A = this chain, B = another copy of it.
Amino acid sequence: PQITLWKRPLVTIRIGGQLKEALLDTGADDTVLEEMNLPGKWKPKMIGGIGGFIKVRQYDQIPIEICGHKAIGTVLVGPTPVNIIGRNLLTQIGCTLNF
């Protein structure tokens, strides 16, 4: 599909039983999800944006479905105000910027 940017590019994602709305975000290197209790091993990390840094949990090889497209990779979980689909998964579902 083609998504215009008049509004926030929010789409439905699925990670486990949870359907969530997430931002398709070309400005995010990594995928950052709102706090959720995922199973598995993880590593601590700090990621920075406007306002400063937040502490997140890095989970690897987590399957996620983004608008019916399958992806699998690293997901960062922490106190973000919005679910963010970053470039690590955007490439997997074939997402490009066009103008």
Query: Once the chains bind, are B81 and A50 in contact (CB under 8 Å)?
Result: yes
A24 to B28, CA, bound (A): 10
Q: Main SS of the interface on chain A? A: loop
Q: In the complex, what's the smallest C-beta–C-beta distance from A91 to chain B, in angstroms?
A: 5
**Which residues of chain B come closer than 8 Å to A9, judged between CB atoms?**
26-27, 97
| Residues on B with beta carbons closer than 8 Å to the beta carbon of A84 | 27, 50
CB-defined interface of A1-21 with B at 8 Å, one 1/0 digit per residue? 111111011000000000000
Would you call B97 and A95 a contact (CB within 8 A)? yes
Q: How many Å lie between the Cα of A87 and that of B4 in the bound state?
A: 9
Interface of A with B (CB < 8 Å)? 1-6, 8-9, 23-29, 32, 47-54, 67, 69, 79-82, 84, 87, 90-91, 93-99
